């Protein structure tokens, strides 16, 4: 969406069309606190799957 808004601003003759872009961000939701909860036993793989943090992958889905 930010790419379209930046392009839209450029076609409008604006000089600062580049300031409408945002950086790309990709990350996993696994946190250092989740690692500590695993070692305390209060976080299992079942509720890591239930919270949408990890999922099971089969060689054909891979």
């Amino acid at each position: 969406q930010a790419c379209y808004k930046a392009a839209e601003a450029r076609k409008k003759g604006d000089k600062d069309w580049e300031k409408h872009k945002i950086p790309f961000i990709q990350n996993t939701r696994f946190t250092p606190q989740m690692a500590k909860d695993i070692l305390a036993g209060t976080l299992t793989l079942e509720d890591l799957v239930a919270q949408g943090i990890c999922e099971f992958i089969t060689p054909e889905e891979a």
Partner: protein, 184 residues
């Protein structure tokens, strides 16, 4: 259906402190979910509770016909074939048993006794059935005889150690240790 859940924005997740030693915990979690060989026990338990009963009650319906090869001997000339038809209705598998001395009452059999005595860690298989015999006559009529059988033990099925039908499944780790089993 469309997915309705939403997660917090990925731009606010704080993972800059994550070390590759912290990720090992994830592996730990995985190994704690499946155990190490948990699939073997689960598969054998599925075969015990659901597999063999389904196979016996569904895929082993017998319906055969045979020539009547008798002699004159009254109406036997007028009957040509007999139709044997039966199926099994009840199926179950129990825990391994052994008979103490002779004419005993089938006490339990622990795995260590089976290992030492060269025995078979096999639990009894009990079946029940209903049978229908049809006799076909030359003129065109037929006669049907139906019987129902009380449950009886056909044989013994091998039991995987540590599974549901194992005696070392109702025992604690100390009790497992003290009956000669590897507690770990």
């Amino acid at each position: 259906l469309r997915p309705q859940i939403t997660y917090g924005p990925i731009e606010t997740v704080d993972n800059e402190e994550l070390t590759e030693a912290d990720m090992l915990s994830f592996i730990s979690a995985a190994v704690n979910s499946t155990g190490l060989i948990g699939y073997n026990i689960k598969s054998f338990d599925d075969l015990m509770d659901n597999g063999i009963p389904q196979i016996v009650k569904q895929m082993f319906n017998v319906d055969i016909t045979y020539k009547d090869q008798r002699d004159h001997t009254e109406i036997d000339k007028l009957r040509e074939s007999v139709q044997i038809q039966f199926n099994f209705t009840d199926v179950n598998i129990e825990r391994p048993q052994h008979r103490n001395y002779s004419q005993g009452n089938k006490i339990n059999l622990l795995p260590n006794k089976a290992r030492l005595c060269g025995l078979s860690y096999s639990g009894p298989v009990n079946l029940a059935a209903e049978v229908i015999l049809t006799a076909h006559y030359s003129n065109g009529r037929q006669e049907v005889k139906r019987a129902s059988i009380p449950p009886f033990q056909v044989s013994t099925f091998p039991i995987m150690r540590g599974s549901n039908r194992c005696h070392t499944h109702h025992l604690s780790k100390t009790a497992k240790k003290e009956i000669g089993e590897d507690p770990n």
